[PDB]
Design a protein around this nucleic acid. Sequence first.
DNA 1: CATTAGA
DNA 2: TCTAATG
Length: 327
Amino acid sequence: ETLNGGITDMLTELANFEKNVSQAIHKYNAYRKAASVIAKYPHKIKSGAEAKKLPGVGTKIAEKIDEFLATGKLRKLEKIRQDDTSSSINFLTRVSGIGPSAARKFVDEGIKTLEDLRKNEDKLNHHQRIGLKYFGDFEKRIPREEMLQMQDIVLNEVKKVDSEYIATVCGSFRRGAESSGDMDVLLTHPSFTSESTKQPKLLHQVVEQLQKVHFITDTLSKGETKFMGVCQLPSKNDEKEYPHRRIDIRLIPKDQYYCGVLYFTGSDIFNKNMRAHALEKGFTINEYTIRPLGVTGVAGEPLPVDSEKDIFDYIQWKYREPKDRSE
DNA sequence: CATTAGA
DNA sequence: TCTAATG
Ligand code: NA
Ligand code: NA
């Protein structure tokens, strides 16, 4: 956690590189298992060799470790950090919709800069066009102050269209967080569950609403269960307009909300731990359900959940407010 | 790890 | 169809 930091950190630097700049899934996959293990290791790694004793720790990595252990640097790390080509990939990737594949192709063409990107909006698809359009806006954090306003709004439409609609604003926001990145609305409705062969309009109606009013300014992708877009707070009695925010809404079968809702709310650790727990308590939890455990090794049978509580009860825990879902 | 675009 | 990019 701190005794092995530089190593694990240099390591992930290295891995992340091979995966992005190069197309070395393997090497990249290497650095990470290694970075994983040394991370675990209970002691100040004193030399490559000591490291080396490790599972996943070959001679390549060991070698790197020593150089780093001796000199607070690495050449390959220094070189990479400089490398414009590679610097460029790392950067283009920030554009929502730009991935590494694209990040490289772009380069190979010579689109290294943001401006490059503009001169060739043509070479870009709608996703990436939007990514570029709201570049500043997409990187900025979401004041919970604004979050509250946003939420107030969707809750208003959802209800307005059908009173039957259930919507939860999951995430860190949910967990009380001061700021957030993007809004995440978990959606569901009674007339939609596990079996009852969809009702796509169910999602659709709402999006239409939210646009209708100008909350949703754009569509990144909208499918029959998952919409991906952009929203915006009505820029008041002017002088101050609002930033374009990322927003994501998802239709859920009523019979899987709470697990889902449980889940998206997190935190990443609260989950595992909660998950690890259900396990002892003779269970299994995952993004949609909770099934009692059978001793034959495994077992099925989806337990019935009417709220975040049922799930707690089941595995018999203390109801933990989203506030304290930290870990 | 599953859902959407796109080509 | 596969392959990408997001969460
Ligand atoms: Na070893
Ligand atoms: Na990106």
